[PDB]
Amino acid sequence: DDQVKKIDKYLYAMRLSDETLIDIMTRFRKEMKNGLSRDFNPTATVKMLPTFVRSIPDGSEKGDFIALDLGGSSFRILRVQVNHEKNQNVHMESEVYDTPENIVHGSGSQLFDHVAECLGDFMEKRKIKDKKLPVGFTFSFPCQQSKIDEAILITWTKRFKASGVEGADVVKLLNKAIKKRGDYDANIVAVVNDTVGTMMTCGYDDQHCEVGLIIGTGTNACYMEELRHIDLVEGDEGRMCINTEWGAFGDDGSLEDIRTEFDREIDRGSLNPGKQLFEKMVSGMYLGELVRLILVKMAKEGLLFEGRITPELLTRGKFNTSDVSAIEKNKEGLHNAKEILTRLGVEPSDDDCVSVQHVCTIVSFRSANLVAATLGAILNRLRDNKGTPRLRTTVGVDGSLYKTHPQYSRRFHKTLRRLVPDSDVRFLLSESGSGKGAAMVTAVAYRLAEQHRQIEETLAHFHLTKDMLLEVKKRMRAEMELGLRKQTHNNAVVKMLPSFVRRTPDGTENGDFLALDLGGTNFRVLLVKIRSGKKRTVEMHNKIYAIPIEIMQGTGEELFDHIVSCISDFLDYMGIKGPRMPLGFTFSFPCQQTSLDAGILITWTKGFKATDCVGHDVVTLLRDAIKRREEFDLDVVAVVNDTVGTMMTCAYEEPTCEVGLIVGTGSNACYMEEMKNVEMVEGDQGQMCINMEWGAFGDNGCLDDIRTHYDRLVDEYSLNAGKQRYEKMISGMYLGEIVRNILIDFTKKGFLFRGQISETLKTRGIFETKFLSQIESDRLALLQVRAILQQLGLNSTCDDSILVKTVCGVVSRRAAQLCGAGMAAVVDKIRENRGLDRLNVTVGVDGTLYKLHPHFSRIMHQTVKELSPKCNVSFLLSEDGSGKGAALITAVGVRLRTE
Ligand SMILES: O=P(O)(O)OC[C@H]1O[C@@H](O)[C@H](O)[C@@H](O)[C@@H]1O
Ligand SMILES: O=P(O)(O)OC[C@H]1O[C@@H](O)[C@H](O)[C@@H](O)[C@@H]1O
Numbered sequence: 001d002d003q004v005k006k007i008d009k010y011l012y013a014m015r016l017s018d019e020t021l022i023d024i025m026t027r028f029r030k031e032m033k034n035g036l037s038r039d040f041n042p043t044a045t046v047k048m049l050p051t052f053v054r055s056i057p058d059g060s061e062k063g064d065f066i067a068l069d070l071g072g073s074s075f076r077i078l079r080v081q082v083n084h085e086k087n088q089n090v091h092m093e094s095e096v097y098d099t100p101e102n103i104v105h106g107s108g109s110q111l112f113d114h115v116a117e118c119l120g121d122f123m124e125k126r127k128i129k130d131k132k133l134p135v136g137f138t139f140s141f142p143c144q145q146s147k148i149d150e151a152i153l154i155t156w157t158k159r160f161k162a163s164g165v166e167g168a169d170v171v172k173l174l175n176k177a178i179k180k181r182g183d184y185d186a187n188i189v190a191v192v193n194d195t196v197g198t199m200m201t202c203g204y205d206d207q208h209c210e211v212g213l214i215i216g217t218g219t220n221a222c223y224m225e226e227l228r229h230i231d232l233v234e235g236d237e238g239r240m241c242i243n244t245e246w247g248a249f250g251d252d253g254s255l256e257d258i259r260t261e262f263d264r265e266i267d268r269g270s271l272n273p274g275k276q277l278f279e280k281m282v283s284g285m286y287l288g289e290l291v292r293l294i295l296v297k298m299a300k301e302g303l304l305f306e307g308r309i310t311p312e313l314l315t316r317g318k319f320n321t322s323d324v325s326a327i328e329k330n331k332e333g334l335h336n337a338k339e340i341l342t343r344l345g346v347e348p349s350d351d352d353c354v355s356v357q358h359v360c361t362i363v364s365f366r367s368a369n370l371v372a373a374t375l376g377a378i379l380n381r382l383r384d385n386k387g388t389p390r391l392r393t394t395v396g397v398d399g400s401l402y403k404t405h406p407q408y409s410r411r412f413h414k415t416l417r418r419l420v421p422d423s424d425v426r427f428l429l430s431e432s433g434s435g436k437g438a439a440m441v442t443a444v445a446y447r448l449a450e451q452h453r454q455i456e457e458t459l460a461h462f463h464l465t466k467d468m469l470l471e472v473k474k475r476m477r478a479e480m481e482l483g484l485r486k487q488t489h490n491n492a493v494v495k496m497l498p499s500f501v502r503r504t505p506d507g508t509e510n511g512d513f514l515a516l517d518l519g520g521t522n523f524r525v526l527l528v529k530i531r532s533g534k535k536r537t538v539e540m541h542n543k544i545y546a547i548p549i550e551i552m553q554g555t556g557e558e559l560f561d562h563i564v565s566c567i568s569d570f571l572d573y574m575g576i577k578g579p580r581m582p583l584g585f586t587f588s589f590p591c592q593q594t595s596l597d598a599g600i601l602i603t604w605t606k607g608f609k610a611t612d613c614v615g616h617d618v619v620t621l622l623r624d625a626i627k628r629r630e631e632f633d634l635d636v637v638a639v640v641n642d643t644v645g646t647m648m649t650c651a652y653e654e655p656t657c658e659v660g661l662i663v664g665t666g667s668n669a670c671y672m673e674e675m676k677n678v679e680m681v682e683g684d685q686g687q688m689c690i691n692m693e694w695g696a697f698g699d700n701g702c703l704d705d706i707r708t709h710y711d712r713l714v715d716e717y718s719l720n721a722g723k724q725r726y727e728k729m730i731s732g733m734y735l736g737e738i739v740r741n742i743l744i745d746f747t748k749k750g751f752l753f754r755g756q757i758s759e760t761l762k763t764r765g766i767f768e769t770k771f772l773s774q775i776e777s778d779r780l781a782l783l784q785v786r787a788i789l790q791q792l793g794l795n796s797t798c799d800d801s802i803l804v805k806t807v808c809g810v811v812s813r814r815a816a817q818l819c820g821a822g823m824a825a826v827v828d829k830i831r832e833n834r835g836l837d838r839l840n841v842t843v844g845v846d847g848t849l850y851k852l853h854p855h856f857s858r859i860m861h862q863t864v865k866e867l868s869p870k871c872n873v874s875f876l877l878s879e880d881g882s883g884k885g886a887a888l889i890t891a892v893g894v895r896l897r898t899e
C-alpha cells in the first residue's frame, strides 16, 4: 500500500491535476489562435498548417489510385479501387516494405530512391505500370504547402533524419528519383498528412467526423476550421482542414513547468534536440525509454532491484514501449513484468514486478491525460464555431500505442469526457489505415488537375515565344516594304500612307488655329494659339461634344452636319465666331492623301460606319456641311491622323521624337521615312511622315499562324469582319471581347460560375478598358476582384475570380508583346535607314488602354528592348492630346499656302 504510495511520491511530478490539465488546455487554445493569425503565425510553435482539403468524402469519389504511406511505423503502399457509379464498392490491396535505419538516416536521395524503387516493384507485382494511376502521398511530417500537390518539408520528426530534404519539395524530390529510374511514370497528385488521411478514412463511414487524431510513433491532430479563420489562405467561404502539428506544443518553452528531468534527459539523447517536446511526453516512440530512465534513476537509489544495475538496464532502448504495454495487461500483468525484468539481467523480486508495473501506469497515464487536454481544446474550438451550446462530433483515431495498449484508450476517453462535458464525442478507430482516406483525397485532387490541364492547354495558345515574336517582327517589316514600293503598294495590307508632313516642328510655327479631334473616345473641338521666338508659348482651349452612335452609324450627311453644329457652338463659346480661321482636322481613319488638305476615306474602322463617306474626300465632305449651314467660314488647311498629330505634339518638346503610337480604341503607328523610300510620292529629298495603318497587318493571313478560335469569333462578329486583324488582338475596343469569349467557353465546360451562362456574360462590350485595368491592378486583393465582378452582374466565387483575373492577364500580356514586336520592326527600320549600329529615338504615345493599364506599357517597352537591342527607345506620353500637333501642322500648311 505504501510501495504504491512510495512511487506516487517519487514520480509525483508526473501526476497531473485536472485543474492543471485545464490550464494546458487553455494554453493550447491560445497557441491555436496565434498559429492561425497572420500577425503571430511567424512566431507560433503550433503551425496550424492548411491542408487544402475542404470536406470529408461525399460518396461521389471513384477511380483507381495508388497511395504511399511513409512516416508511420511501417512503409506501406496500397491500391484503392472505388466506383459506386458502376456498382463496385471500396476495395484495396496493400503491401509493406522494409526501411532500414540506414535509408531513414541517410541522404534524401538514398531515401527517395528507395521509395521510388518500392513503388516500381509494387506496380510490377500487379503489372499496372502501363496505367497512369494517380498517386496520393501520405507523408507524416510537417509540410509547407501553397497547393495540395506541393509539400516543402519544414523539419523531420520521429525516427527520420535524412539529409538534403528539409526546406525542399518532397514531391519534386520524389519525382526526380522516379524519372531517374526511367522504369515507370508517376503522377503524384497530392500529399496529405496522416492525421488528415485518418480523418478522411473515418469520415467515409461517419459523415460527422471533423477530427483526425494519431497516437503512435508520434502524435498529432487535424480538424475542420472555418476558411474565414485561416488568415494565411485567401477566402472566407466554407471550411478547410488544418493540421495543427501539436507535437511541437511548448517548443518555445511553454511547458517547462510541466517537463521533468526525465523528459529533458530523454531529449538530450533524441535525434532532434529541442523540438517536438509535447510529443516527447506522449507518443509510443518515447514512452518506453522514458520509463527505463526512471527505473535506472530508482535502482541508482536502491529503490528497485535491490539497487542492482545491469549493463542492460543502462543500455539505450532496451525497454521497449511494447514492454510498457504487456506489463500493464490485466491478465498476465505482473507475470509479464517478471519475464521482462528478468531478461534485463536484474533479479526480479516478485515485489519489484509490482513496483515497476506501477511506474508504467504513471507514465502511460500522463500521456493519455495530456492528449486529452489538447484534443479538448480542439473540440471546444469546434463548438465555438458552430455556435451551438452542445457539440456532437466524431473523431478518427489511429496509432499503435492507442490501438495496442490495455488501458490507454480507456483512460484517454474518460479524462476527455470529464474535461469536455457539454459535448457528445464518438471515437471511430481507423481499421483500414490512411490509405482509404488518402485515396479519397487523391480522387478530388485529380478531378481538379484535369480541369487545370485543360484550362492551361487553352490559355497556352496565347503564349508567344521570343522566337515567335521575332517572326512577327520579321513579317511586319516585309509588309512595311510591300506598302512603300509603288509596284506592290496596290495589294499591300499595311498601306503605309504618306501624310505630307515632312518635318517635325522647327520652332517658328506661329498663329491662332482651330482643330478637330474625331476618332477616339471623345470627339472634341479646340482653339490653339502658338507664339514663338522670345516668348514661345502655346495656349489651347477645348470642349467635348457627344456623338450619338446613331449618327456615328447614320449617314455621312447627318454626321458632318452634326460636326459643323458643334464647331459652331464652340465658336460662340470661345467667342471667336466671325473671321476666317485656319483649321486642322484630326480624322483617325485611313485616308489616301494627295496633299496636306485632301483625304479620301479609304475605309471605316473601329465603331464608325456612316454611309456615303467611304470613297469621298473628308475635307470636302466637311467643307460642304460648312457651306450648307452658312453660319461662318473656315479655312481647312489640313487633315491629320492622330498618330501623326501625337508625334508632332511630342516632338514639339522632344526633338528626337520621330515615331507616333496610339493604343486606345484602335491601334496604329507612324514614323519618319526617307523620301527616297516613299516610291508613291515623287522625290527622294528629305523625309515624309508615314501613317502605317498597321492595324490591318494580318488581313492577308500572315497572322493566322498565331490567331485563335477566340480571335476568329471576335473578328467574325465585328462591324468589319475580316479587316484590322492585328489591331483586334491589341486595342481596348476588342481585348475585352476576346476575354468574354474565353470565359463563356470555360463556363460551358463547367469551369466557371457553376456552368451557368448569364445575360451579363452574353452582353458584348461588358469588359471595358477601365475594368480590364482595375482587375489586373497589383494593389488589388481577391476579395476586391470578386467585388468588381459581382458589380458587373457576374456571381463569382473567389475561385472564379482567380481564373478570370488570370485570363485577363494572358490576353493583355499577349497584346503588349505583339504590339512591341510591331514597334520593334519600326525602330529597327529607322536605324537601318540612317545606317546606324545604334539608334536613340523617342516615341510619342497616347491611348486610354496605354495610359490606364497597369502592365501593358511595361511589358511593351520590355519587348521592344528585347527584339531591337540596337535601338534605345524612349516613350513620351502625350498629355495634351493630338490638338497641339494638328495646329502645329496647320501652321506649316498655311505657310506653304501663302507662299
Ligand atoms: O502508430 P504508427 O505505427 O506509428 O502509425 C500510425 C498511422 O501513421 C500514419 O502515418 C499512417 O498513414 C497510418 O497507416 C498509421 O496507422
Ligand atoms: O483611346 P482613345 O480613345 O482611342 O484615344 C487615343 C487618342 O485618339 C486620338 O484620336 C486623339 O487625337 C487623342 O487625343 C486621343 O488621346
Ligand SMILES: OC[C@H]1O[C@@H](O)[C@H](O)[C@@H](O)[C@@H]1O
Pocket (backbone or CB within 6 Å): 071, 072, 140, 141, 142, 157, 158, 193, 194, 195, 214, 217, 218, 219, 220, 221, 245, 247, 279
Ligand atoms: O505520424 C503522426 C504525426 O507524427 C508527428 O511526429 C509529426 O510531427 C506529424 O507530422 C504527424 O502527423
Ligand SMILES: OC[C@H]1O[C@@H](O)[C@H](O)[C@@H](O)[C@@H]1O
Pocket (backbone or CB within 6 Å): 519, 520, 587, 588, 589, 590, 605, 606, 641, 642, 643, 662, 665, 666, 667, 668, 669, 693, 695, 727
Ligand atoms: O485611333 C487610332 C488608330 O485607329 C485605327 O484603327 C485607325 O485606322 C487609324 O487611322 C488610327 O490612327
Ligand SMILES: [Ca+2]
Pocket (backbone or CB within 6 Å): 227, 228, 229, 230, 231, 232, 233, 234, 235, 236
Ligand atoms: Ca482566409
Ligand SMILES: [Ca+2]
Pocket (backbone or CB within 6 Å): 675, 676, 677, 678, 679, 680, 681, 682, 683, 684
Ligand atoms: Ca519618293
